[PDB]
Design a protein around this ligand. Structure first.
Ligand SMILES: Nc1ncnc2c1ncn2[C@@H]1O[C@H](COP(=O)(O)OP(=O)(O)O)[C@@H](O)[C@H]1O
Ligand SMILES: Nc1ncnc2c1ncn2[C@@H]1O[C@H](COP(=O)(O)OP(=O)(O)O)[C@@H](O)[C@H]1O
Lengths: 975, 346, 342
């Protein structure tokens, strides 16, 4: 009977309030019930009205945006319009009681009035209202009004007009005393422990422990810390219900098992909403003190308590290792079956999976995941729903969407839940609430188990037809309207679970979402938050243990214990993980994030980029060193064979002195390059995944921070390191410069960042829109320019995906949320065919398809979903670019022939240098593959010719230097 | 010879490079064939398990299923066919003169990964069954090499099949069972009651040796040749279904278009992967690293193999006893996800 | 079982890029790892030897030695560890990921002042230790979990050319004709043994099996567990010495040659023992099998390769976790390998 919400334990205050409420209601007067949340106004009302065959209760929950139309819609299925106009209840012998929760919430207009308050005072004082469309006066005959609210001193509450409260009888419902709460929950614990008779003498100490824990949580964690720290007896009854469920679906229990299970339930009820680690430690110490004081057992941490029914037929505490292995295999199968995502399963991941499973295994059990973006909220929800056999429904709310689409999606989900008995998990992101009407719809869906506004008139009648047919299909014997719609409500409550994804809880829309009354009092608030440093260490180790890293001498540096977040330093791997954690912390500290949750997307992107880059660099370095070694060995063997025992071969050997010297120098410096490889790869990955949206000064300061931090952990790096000299090759540089890149080094770094991003869709901030024509020159005729602000963009994008064209989407500040699966790289693989879902139908990815997003508006609006999952690159002109363009313009307008000759000379010199480099590479390749002497002589002659060409062409530099010195003052004044 | 129960400890163990997805037993010689998630196909003789006999990488993806058949004729070799995720079904030849694999050909026609194959001999002509993720059961001819009939028995992709003459039963990802008569290609009955996807479904073949579910009830069921079906799903349960008698191309009766769960075997701690019937005993494995042995008469588990593998137990099989062409020897082999395979002798 | 006789003719012929340096056999599967003189390490299947499974350019110079073993952790996923030594003064640690059949380079071991000549790897209950020897007259002992050296000392005046590890005692073969058994945890010598006239090639310990040399003599010898050892050099003679029992940290005294072998036409390179028979190759391109009881050659496999024989691999019969498979692979300098299966 603990599950049934209709049970009320009769106390003195309960029976007193119930009978005076009945006396007031039978006197035909308005009633307003006031008190702190969780006092029991709804409880005492329902207890009073269950024992009566004269009244019916209609539940309406008010929010910040409630209208008269909502009240009338909730009354459609309970009232009949008759002309004797008069609004009778549908029943002829039972009165109707209109119960209005949270009646203070309906906000004021700009002139300080409430539409709902005045409507209700018209209903009570005048017994009727005016029907808006036909302008006629209806009469309220047998409808009573009961209001429930909180004191106006509570946040979000507003004072009501005296004309309202003049017609209403006000009763104050306060919190029960600690003794009364202890008695109530000792009765509950006796009911629970009837299943375990061997511990029937521990019911009272458990009740005192729970009540003391609730009182201490209310005292310690107040509203002044966080706005959602509202505790009530509802937390205690939630804990009691969870305890009953856990023993009911569990094995034979011991005293230690019972205490640990109660502690786990306390963790999941009282401490899920805690934000800071300090409050988590405070709750841990509070649980320790409560257990020692009231129940005179091992560790009582959140990670130490892992109760799950996944590993066995019964809900019980399980080991960490076997649970981790089971979740790893299950997520491998999940990646095979639904969507391929390379995720790492860590300890906090396991704990969050367990608590999401606990919520989704309940009846009328919802979730409100609050945390940073790219933490694993929606993917964990989908994994848990797949494990529980639920159907994931993510609404396709995009731009140019209205109430009609959301109502259609909600009605389809409700019909599937009820008629088609399809157990559905509904994931609603904070970005799917375009305006507050969506939030009001979700409030109505959560407070009740139906949306009365979505079933009106002929839609209501056809819903009755469908439900009658479905009930005849199952064979249940029911024909009345009331019982049939109660079956509807029961099916919706049983089969529908709603999970809310919130990224930034300090946004006004997200603040109203969290502080919404029905959302607050029905959802299980799971403040996941940002990743703690232990989680980052675990995931970094799990993605860098599979890559060759330790290949050089490493000495453990002398560092403080508090500055080491992994296990104590033993290899380069732990030092690298600690370096990345420290740089993530320093990055989010220097960007003044404040209390905004710190998204770990940068950390994961840096880890993946570092892994791939160091793998490629290690392969290239090993291949090049092997080539140099075998070439030197072959040259030495040929020299020895010639000495032991043909003029062309002698000339070739004599001409290879410079090549031999270069090979010897590379062999000597191989050790130095091996010393600093890991640090260079780390700094590179930081460049691609961190420095995209930074100017040159911020990049330089942050590189200084990273360099000192990387030298702290005894990791070597190139002292003369440069991003262009490490990631940008000569061929790529020429392709970019002939496409239209500026000579500025910042632009070259940005172009290298955007081109070397093959795992995340890049984002371009070019106010001059130069990158659009640059990329269009890069791909020539296969490129296509789309925009979010144009009609038919979806069809063009789908056609380009089918064909394989390179797509550039302008107007990046108007992100269209149906390309989200393209943004998140969510692909479905069917053998050699890869398909993605855009809009409402699947489309085949060609594999040559590329996505670029462009935005020319600085300081625009970028959603957190898009912001956290793109390589956002800023193309902002700086001093050097302005000086270069000024010099180019003044030289073109002063002496065009000189400027043309200079740029042609620069192009010739760089092309000749690339030809020389490729010729040396070809010489090395040909020597490794060993007529040949003549070819080698020709290659040497061509290299000498290129060197002579460079020597002859390097005689015009002083003229360019003099011109630069002449126009430098013009450039500096221009900037 | 029929009531044999395997011992609590395997005598010999097989080590494989990757996860073992399917294992099959040669009806004549003491050799076991082992599939691999990496894509290789192995074969180990039952007495010298230190080294294999033949192994080649024919599929570019993971093998999903395979089976064996010893052909007979009125006018004679072992046929092995292997499905995989490489969008192609490969047919091989097992020559015992050299004990070396010989590829016959490869089969095509599926739009997604194929997960089950069944081969049967009928009047000197053999056919190979196939169900894939494209929601189609495209069973094919080994001789001609072309397709015969394509039908869609489920709204969601079919995970397992079984053939008993001209009738095929299909278990899919939509938690339903559907029995279709292949030559007409029409659905006969729908079996619901599971709430998690079906992993393996097969017929309960009639036996003559007194097992409750392996005998016909009335004369009509004996004439039809089949009465009961066994299915496993991700519900941690094994359910025994019954085939309603159709109007007999059989016509599905409107009043007899549904199954009926005669028994519901439960007790596994995870998804039941593969099942097998030997006499009155039902042998099943699951992801709980365990193998049960469910007696058919009592409907209760008899012997439990706790922690047989350190990982998931993907597959197992016995020797077919309903066919006189294959002697039901006391051999059982279980494949595991821990890159290991255990064989129980005598 | 352990008394199987190898076939007269080879069964498989696998070609490599250069001269074979070291050959190791995968203890669980028909997989052979071979390293060439160019530093490239190969993974060949015994049923498909035409193409390798995976190839990686590990070292930049010639490979000197290689040893493999399968970890047995009581808690942690099992994997195989490949330790390869070369002339690059560095030893890399690999891992065979059979799921995709590739090579992952776990870590390297740096610190040797010369070319590492030999390796030997062993597993404790929950720890793995790495043994090595180089030309710097030192034997550096590393740890697989940590990655840095735990013991480093000079066991001989000359350069050590071979080393064997068995528990806390290590027998090191050097360019000098003498050897030395030293305690690993204490870093002190225990006994020495001379008698040869040429540099030592490969020295390996002998494990007792529950035979004249595999049976303990007294209870004290059984408690110690080490009584006999096998040595080889360039003097074309393999002599089995007796290890005296020091006064037990052990406190240190000469090795007595209780047996000798003759008949080798060149300098021996590798010595392999399987049960009661010992197989060893040399530069004469012949493989001789000598019984431990009679102490004479029984079967000869001549004209195996055109060049000299480099090394041979045999599964250990003294390990409970290692199955004594009936297979043996021998490598030669003619860029070819011979496999005798069953
Ligand atoms: N006999 C009782 N006396 C007082 N409080 C009780 C009794 N039984 C249950 N409660 C507690 O009162 C709570 C009811 O609060 P509720 O009516 O939802 O708040 P509100 O009045 O704001 O709607 C329950 O969560 C339960 O824990
Ligand atoms: N445990 C993890 N290990 C690695 N990557 C993760 C993990 N959790 C989340 N991610 C990253 O987050 C992305 C999906 O997270 P998601 O649930 O969509 O976050 P959100 O709900 O905040 O949008 C993936 O692309 C993945 O790279």
């Amino acid at each position: 009977e603990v599950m049934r919400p209709d049970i009320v334990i009769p106390t003195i205050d309960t029976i007193k309030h119930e009978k005076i409420f009945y006396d007031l209601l039978n006197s035909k007067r308005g009633i307003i019930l006031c008190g702190p949340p969780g006092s029991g106004k709804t409880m005492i009302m329902n207890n009073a009205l269950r024992n009566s065959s004269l009244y019916d209760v209609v539940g309406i929950n008010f929010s910040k945006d409630t209208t008269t139309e909502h009240i009338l819609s909730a009354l459609h299925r309970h009232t009949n319009y008759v002309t004797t106009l008069t609004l009778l209840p549908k029943s002829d012998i039972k009165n109707l009681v209109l119960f209005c929760d949270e009646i203070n919430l309906p906000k004021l207009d700009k002139y300080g009035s409430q539409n709902v308050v005045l409507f209700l005072r018209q209903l009570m004082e005048k017994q009727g209202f005016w029907k808006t469309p036909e302008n006629k006066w209806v009469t309220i005959e047998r409808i009573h009004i009961v209001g429930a609210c909180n004191p106006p001193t509570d946040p979000g509450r507003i004072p009501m007009s005296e004309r309202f409260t003049r017609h209403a009888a006000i009763l104050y419902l306060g919190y029960p005393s600690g003794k009364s709460l202890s008695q109530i929950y000792e009765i509950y614990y006796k009911a629970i422990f009837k299943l375990v008779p061997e511990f029937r003498s521990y019911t009272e100490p458990f009740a005192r422990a729970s009540v003391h824990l609730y009182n201490e949580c209310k005292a310690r964690y107040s509203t002044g810390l966080q706005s959602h720290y509202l505790f009530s007896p509802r937390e205690l009854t939630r804990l009691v219900r969870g305890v009953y469920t856990a023993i009911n679906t569990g094995p034979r229990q011991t005293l230690r098992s019972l205490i640990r299970l109660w502690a786990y339930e306390a963790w999941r009820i009282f401490a899920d909403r805690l934000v800071g680690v300090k409050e988590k430690n405070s709750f841990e110490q509070l649980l320790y003190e409560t257990v020692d004081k009231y129940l005179p057992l091992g560790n009582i941490s959140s990670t130490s308590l892992l109760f799950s029914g996944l590993l066995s037929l019964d809900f019980k505490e399980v080991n960490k290792t076997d649970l981790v292995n089971f979740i790893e295999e299950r997520f491998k199968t999940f990646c095979d079956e639904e969507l391929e995502v390379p995720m790492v399963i860590h300890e906090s991941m396991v704990d969050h999976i367990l608590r999401i499973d606990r919520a989704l295994k309940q009846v009328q059990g919802h979730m409100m995941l609050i945390g940073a973006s790219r933490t694993g909220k929606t993917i964990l929800t989908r994994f848990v729903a797949w494990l529980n056999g639920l159907k994931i429904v993510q609404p396709k709310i995009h731009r140019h969407s209205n109430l009609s689409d959301f109502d259609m999606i909600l009605k389809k989900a409700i019909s599937d839940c009820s008629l088609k008995e399809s157990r559905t998990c509904l994931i609603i992101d904070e970005s799917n609430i375009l305006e507050t009407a969506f939030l009001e719809r979700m409030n109505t869906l959560l407070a009740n188990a139906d949306i009365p506004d979505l079933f009106q008139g002929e839609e209501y009648d056809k819903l009755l037809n469908n439900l009658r047919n479905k009930t005849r299909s199952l064979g249940l014997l029911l024909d009345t309207e009331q019982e049939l719609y109660d079956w509807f409500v029961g099916e919706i409550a049983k089969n529908l679970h709603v999970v809310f994804t919130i990224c930034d809880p300090t946004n006004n829309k997200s603040s109203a979402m969290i502080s919404s009354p029905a959302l607050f009092n029905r959802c299980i608030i799971n403040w996941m938050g940002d990743w703690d440093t232990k989680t980052m260490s675990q995931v970094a180790n799990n993605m860098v243990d599979v890559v060759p890293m330790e290949f050089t001498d490493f000495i453990v540096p002398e560092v403080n214990k508090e500055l080491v977040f992994t296990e104590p330093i033993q290899t380069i791997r732990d030092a690298v993980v600690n370096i990345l954690i420290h740089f993530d912390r320093n990055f989010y500290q220097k960007m003044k994030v404040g209390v905004n949750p710190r998204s770990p997307g940068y950390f994961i992107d840096g880890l993946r980029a570092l892994v791939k880059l160091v793998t490629a660099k290690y392969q290239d370095l090993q291949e090049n060193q092997r080539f140099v070694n075998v070439g030197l060995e072959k040259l030495n063997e040929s020299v020895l064979k010639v000495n032991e025992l043909l003029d062309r071969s002698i000339s070739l050997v004599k001409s290879l002195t410079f090549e031999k010297e270069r090979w010897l120098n590379t062999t000597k410096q191989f050790s130095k390059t091996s010393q600093e490889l890991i640090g260079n790869c780390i700094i590179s990955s930081i460049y691609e995944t961190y420095f995209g949206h930074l100017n040159e000064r911020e990049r330089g300061d942050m590189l200084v921070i990273l360099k000192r931090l990387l030298g702290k952990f005894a990791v070597k790096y190139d002292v003369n390191y440069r991003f262009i000299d490490y990631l940008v090759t000569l061929d790529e540089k020429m392709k970019w410069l002939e496409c239209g890149l500026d000579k500025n080094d910042y632009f070259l770094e940005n172009m290298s960042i955007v081109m070397n991003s093959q795992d995340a869709v890049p984002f371009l901030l070019d106010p001059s829109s130069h990158m659009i024509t640059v990329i269009s020159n890069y791909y020539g005729n296969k490129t296509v320019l789309l925009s979010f602000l144009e009609e038919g963009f979806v069809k063009r994008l789908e056609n380009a995906v089918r064909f394989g064209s390179v797509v550039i989407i302008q107007d990046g500040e108007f992100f269209d949320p149906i390309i989200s699966r393209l943004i998140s790289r969510e692909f479905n693989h069917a053998g050699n065919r890869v398909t993605v879902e855009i809009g409402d139908h699947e489309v085949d990815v060609s594999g040559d398809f590329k996505l670029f997003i462009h935005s020319c508006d600085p300081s625009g609006d970028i959603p957190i979903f898009l912001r956290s999952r793109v390589r956002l690159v800023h193309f902002v002109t700086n001093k050097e670019s302005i000086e270069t363009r000024i010099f180019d313009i003044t030289l073109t307008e002063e002496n065009a022939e000189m400027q043309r000759k200079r740029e042609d000379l620069i192009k010739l010199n760089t092309e000749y240098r690339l030809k020389l480099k490729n010729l040396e590479k070809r010489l090395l390749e040909e020597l490794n593959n060993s007529e040949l002497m003549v070819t080698l002589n020709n290659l040497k002659k061509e290299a000498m010719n290129i060197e002579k060409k460079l020597s002859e062409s390097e005689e015009f530099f002083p003229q360019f230097d003099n011109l630069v010195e002449e126009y430098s003052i013009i450039g500096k004044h221009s900037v | 010879v029929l009531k044999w129960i395997p011992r609590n400890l395997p005598s010999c163990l097989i080590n494989v490079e990757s996860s073992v997805t399917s294992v099959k037993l040669h009806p004549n010689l003491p050799i076991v064939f082992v599939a691999t998630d990496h894509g290789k196909l192995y074969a180990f003789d039952l007495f010298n398990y230190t080294i294999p006999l033949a192994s080649l990488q024919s599929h570019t993806k993971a093998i999903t299923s395979m089976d064996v058949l010893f052909t007979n004729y009125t006018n004679n070799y072992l046929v092995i066919v292997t499905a995989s995720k490489d969008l192609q079904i490969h047919v091989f030849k097992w020559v015992s003169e050299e004990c070396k694999f010989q590829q016959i050909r490869s089969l095509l026609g599926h739009e997604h990964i194929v997960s089950a194959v069944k081969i049967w001999q009928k009047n000197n002509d053999v056919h190979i069954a196939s169900c894939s993720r494209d929601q189609t059961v495209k069973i094919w001819d080994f001789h001609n090499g072309w397709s015969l009939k394509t039908f869609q028995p489920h709204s969601q992709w079919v995970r397992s099949i079984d053939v008993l003459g001209d009738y095929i039963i299909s278990g899919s990802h939509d938690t339903t069972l559907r029995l279709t008569h292949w030559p007409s290609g029409n659905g006969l009955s729908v079996g619901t009651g599971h709430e998690f996807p079906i992993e393996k479904v097969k017929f309960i073949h009639f036996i003559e040796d007194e097992i409750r579910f392996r005998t016909p009830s009335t004369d009509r069921y004996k004439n039809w040749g089949m009465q009961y079906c066994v299915s496993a799903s991700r519900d941690r349960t094994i359910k025994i279904w019954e085939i309603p008698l159709p109007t007999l191309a059989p016509i599905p009766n409107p009043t007899d278009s549904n199954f009926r769960c005669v028994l519901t075997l439960k007790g596994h701690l995870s998804w039941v992967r593969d099942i097998s019937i030997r006499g009155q005993y039902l042998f099943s494995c699951a992801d709980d690293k365990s193998v049960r042995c469910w007696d058919l008469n009592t409907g209760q588990c008899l012997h439990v193999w706790e922690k047989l593998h350190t990982g998931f137990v993907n597959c197992l099989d016995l020797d077919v006893d309903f066919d006189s062409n294959v002697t039901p020897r006391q051999m059982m082999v279980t494949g595991g996800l821990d890159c290991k395979s255990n064989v129980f002798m005598r």
